[PDB]
Amino acid sequence: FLPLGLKVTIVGLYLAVCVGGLLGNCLVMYVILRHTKMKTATNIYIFNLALADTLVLLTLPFQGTDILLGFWPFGNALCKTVIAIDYYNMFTSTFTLTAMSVDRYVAICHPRTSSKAQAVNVAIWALASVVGVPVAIMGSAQVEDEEIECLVEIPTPQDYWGPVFAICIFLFSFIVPVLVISVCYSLMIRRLRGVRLLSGSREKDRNLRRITRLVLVVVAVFVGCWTPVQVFVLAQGLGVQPSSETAVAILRFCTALGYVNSCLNPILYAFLDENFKACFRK
Ligand SMILES: Cc1cccc2c1CC[C@H](CN1CCC(c3c(Cl)cccc3Cl)CC1)C[C@@H]2O
C-alpha cells in the first residue's frame, strides 16, 4: 500500500505533468499544423510523438484517481481505453524514434518527404494496433480480491504466458527498437570519421548536425525515463512482486518518471530545435 502523503505527491506530479504536457504538446502540434510549414519528415514524426503523448496524458487524471482511491471506479470501457492508450504510447514512441533515427541515417549517408513520413506514421500505428487492440480486448476491470483493479488478463497457465508476454513485450517494445537506433547512430559515426564540412553545403550541414543531436537527445531522455519501468515490469511478468511499501513507492515513482517524459518532450524541442525555439516565442 501507500501513505496518503505520497499519494498526494504523486498525483500532484501527475497534474503538473498533465497540464504542462498537454499545453506543450498541443502547442507543438498546433505549430507544425496551423502556424507554419514546418512539415519536415522529422517534424511529422515529432507530431506523431506529441500525439501519443497527448493521449496518455489524458489518461493521467484517471490513473491518479485510481491511485488515490486504491481501486478502479470507472468500469471496463475506460479501463480498456487507458490500457490500450498505454501500450499504444510505448510502441508508437519507440517505433517513431526508430523511424527518426533511420531517417537521420538516410540524410547523412544519402544527402525524405513529409508524406512518406506520414505513411511511416500510419504503419507505426498499424503495428501499434497489432499489439494495442488485443490488450484492449483482454484488458478488464476485475474485482480480484473483492476490490476493483484494471489489468490485462494473462491466459492460463499464467506461469508460462506471463514470461512469454513479458519477454516479448520487453524485446519488441524496447530492446529491438533501441538496438536499431544504436545501429543507425553507430553507422553514422563510422560514416562521419575524417569528414570535415563534407556532405554538401556547410550551413545546411550544420542544420543536419543539429537535427541529429536533437533526435539522439530525445531518444536518450526517453530510454533513460522508461528503462526502470521496462525492467521492473519484465520482473513483474516473472512473478517477482513488490510487497514492501517502499517498493511500491519506487515502482510508482518510476512510472511517474515515464509520464514525466511524456511532458518532457516539448521542452527538449524548445532548447534543442531552433525552429521550435523561435516559433514557440512567436
Ligand atoms: C494506476 C493505473 C490505473 C489503471 C491501469 C494502470 C495503472 C497504473 C500504471 C500502469 C502503467 N503501465 C506503464 C507502461 C508499462 C509498460 C507497457 Cl504498457 C509496455 C511495455 C513495458 C512497460 Cl514497463 C506497463 C505499466 C498501467 C495500468 O493499466
Swiss-Prot record:
Detected in blood leukocytes. It is found in: Cell membrane; Cytoplasmic vesicle. The record marks 66, 86 as: Important for G protein-mediated signaling. It is a multi-pass membrane protein. GO terms for molecular function: G protein-coupled receptor activity; neuropeptide binding; nociceptin receptor activity. Its main location: membrane. The keyword Cell membrane applies. Keywords: Behavior, Cell membrane, Cytoplasmic vesicle, Disulfide bond, G-protein coupled receptor, Glycoprotein, Lipoprotein, Membrane, Palmitate, Phosphoprotein, Receptor, Transducer, Transmembrane, Transmembrane helix. One of its GO terms (biological process) is adenylate cyclase-inhibiting G protein-coupled receptor signaling pathway. GO terms for cellular component: cytoplasmic vesicle; neuron projection; plasma membrane; synaptic membrane. Changing residue 230 to A: Impairs G protein-mediated inhibition of adenylate cyclase. Residues 66-80, 139-161, 236-250 are extracellular. The keyword Transmembrane helix applies. Coiled coil: none annotated. Residues 31-43, 103-115, 187-214 are cytoplasmic. The chain crosses the membrane at residues 5-30, 44-65, 81-102, 116-138, 162-186, 215-235, 251-272. Belongs to the G-protein coupled receptor 1 family. G-protein coupled opioid receptor that functions as a receptor for the endogenous neuropeptide nociceptin. Ligand binding causes a conformation change that triggers signaling via guanine nucleotide-binding proteins (G proteins) and modulates the activity of down-stream effectors. Signaling via G proteins mediates inhibition of adenylate cyclase activity and calcium channel activity. Arrestins modulate signaling via G proteins and mediate the activation of alternative signaling pathways that lead to the activation of MAP kinases. This is Nociceptin receptor.
